[PDB]
Design an enzyme around this catalytic site. Structure first.
Site, PDB file in Angstrom:
ATOM      1  N   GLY A  39     -76.589 148.259 -38.129  1.00 50.38           N
ATOM      2  CA  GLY A  39     -76.687 146.541 -37.980  1.00 50.38           C
ATOM      3  C   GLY A  39     -78.012 145.750 -37.808  1.00 50.38           C
ATOM      4  CB  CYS A  40     -79.595 145.822 -34.670  1.00 50.98           C
ATOM      5  SG  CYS A  40     -78.175 145.521 -33.619  1.00 50.98           S
ATOM      6  CB  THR A  41     -82.105 148.480 -38.846  1.00 52.79           C
ATOM      7  OG1 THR A  41     -82.258 149.267 -37.727  1.00 52.79           O
ATOM      8  CG2 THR A  41     -83.293 148.332 -39.655  1.00 52.79           C
TER       9      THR A  41
END
Ligand code: NA
Ligand code: NA
Length: 156
Positions: free
Chosen positions: A45-47
């Site tokens: 998700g953060c990527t």
């Protein structure tokens, strides 16, 4: 027009960046600043969120705006994350969660029979004069960078 008031000291906090340099929020005076907080380096998700912002950088440039990603991961972790993903904007290593607390993005969840703290995905738009003019909290990644860009365009 401010949606959040920050402690005056927040703007002078030394922020450790990927690449081994330091900045402060005050150093960004004169242009729009997107500050996006995310829970962890190098997760799916953060990527996705970081790559989404990265893809839109030229559109952020067109408004003279700059982006800063923030988590509590180390500078080294940030360096690896940025190198692997090709990010063209800096990541703040907020290891002591000073900036996170200032923006009140550290949230508590009662789970596993205990009180567990963590970074809530959140994004803020800071005016050229350092006012927080818009906030997004408990952010869903899909479509987020697009919405932040649209909002920037509307405010600027
Ligand atoms: Na630091
Ligand atoms: Na600013």
């Amino acid at each position: 027009d401010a949606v959040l008031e920050l402690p005056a000291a927040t703007f002078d906090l030394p922020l450790s960046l990927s690449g081994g340099t330091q900045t402060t929020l005050r150093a960004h005076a004169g242009h729009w600043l997107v500050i996006y907080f995310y829970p962890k380096d190098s997760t799916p998700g953060c990527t996705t969120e970081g790559l989404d912002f990265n893809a839109l950088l030229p559109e952020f440039d067109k408004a003279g705006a700059k982006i800063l990603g923030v988590s509590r991961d180390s500078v080294k972790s940030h360096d690896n994350f940025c190198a692997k993903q090709g990010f063209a904007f800096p990541l703040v290593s907020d290891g002591d969660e000073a900036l996170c607390r200032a923006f009140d993005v550290i949230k508590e969840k009662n789970m596993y029979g205990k009180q567990v703290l963590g970074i809530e995905r959140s994004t803020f738009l800071l005016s050229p004069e350092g006012q927080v003019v818009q906030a997004w909290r408990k952010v869903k990644v899909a479509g987020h960078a697009d919405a932040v860009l649209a909002a920037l365009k509307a405010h600027a």
